[PDB]
Design a protein around this ligand. Structure first.
Ligand code: W97
Ligand code: CA
Length: 152
């Protein structure tokens, strides 16, 4: 835990103390059994609950690209990286788009599309979301060396 060379450490460092305190409630979003690991099913349930409707392949992919253990599983730090992923690409991503083409007040609705991490957390947490969403990034990014090959 001292030799920070993983993606979880980054996630933990890209957030803020009070915001992490709010993320504590994230376990309640689905609530497996009061203490357990979450899989594509459980996760897919919560995310489809916001109106979106993807495939298991989508769920696995987003977890796999961050899963260093080679097993998509959500967990203490594994959960954290998930939440940061949406805000990460929204702040500094390449190709990632919320499909928003109107940055105004009379803008389109939820549309059941990939919206901001803020909007989703507001729905997932059930309006408990009040912390300031600050993703520590800038106008700098590059290609990652992360590319896995395995099918389960
Ligand atoms: C629950 C949940 C959750 C948390 N963090 C995410 N970051 C993402 O990109 N997603 C989905 C789209 C909402 C990927 C398909 C995330 N779902
Ligand atoms: Ca895992």
């Amino acid at each position: 835990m001292a030799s920070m060379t993983d993606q979880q450490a980054e996630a933990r460092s890209y957030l803020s103390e009070e915001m992490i305190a709010e993320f504590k409630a994230a376990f309640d979003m689905f609530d497996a059994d009061g203490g357990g690991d979450i899989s594509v099913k459980e996760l897919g349930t919560v995310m489809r609950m916001l109106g979106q409707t993807p495939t298991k392949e989508e769920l696995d992919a987003i977890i796999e690209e961050v899963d260093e253990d080679g097993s998509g599983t959500i967990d203490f730090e594994e959960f954290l990286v998930m939440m940061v992923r949406q805000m990460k690409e929204d702040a500094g991503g390449a190709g990632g788009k919320l499909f928003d083409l109107r940055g105004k007040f009379k803008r389109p609705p939820l549309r059941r599309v990939r919206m901001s991490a803020d909007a989703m957390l507001k729905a997932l947490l059930g309006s408990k979301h009040k912390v300031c969403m600050d993703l520590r990034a800038n106008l700098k990014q590059v290609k990652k060396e992360d590319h896995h090959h395995h099918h389960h």
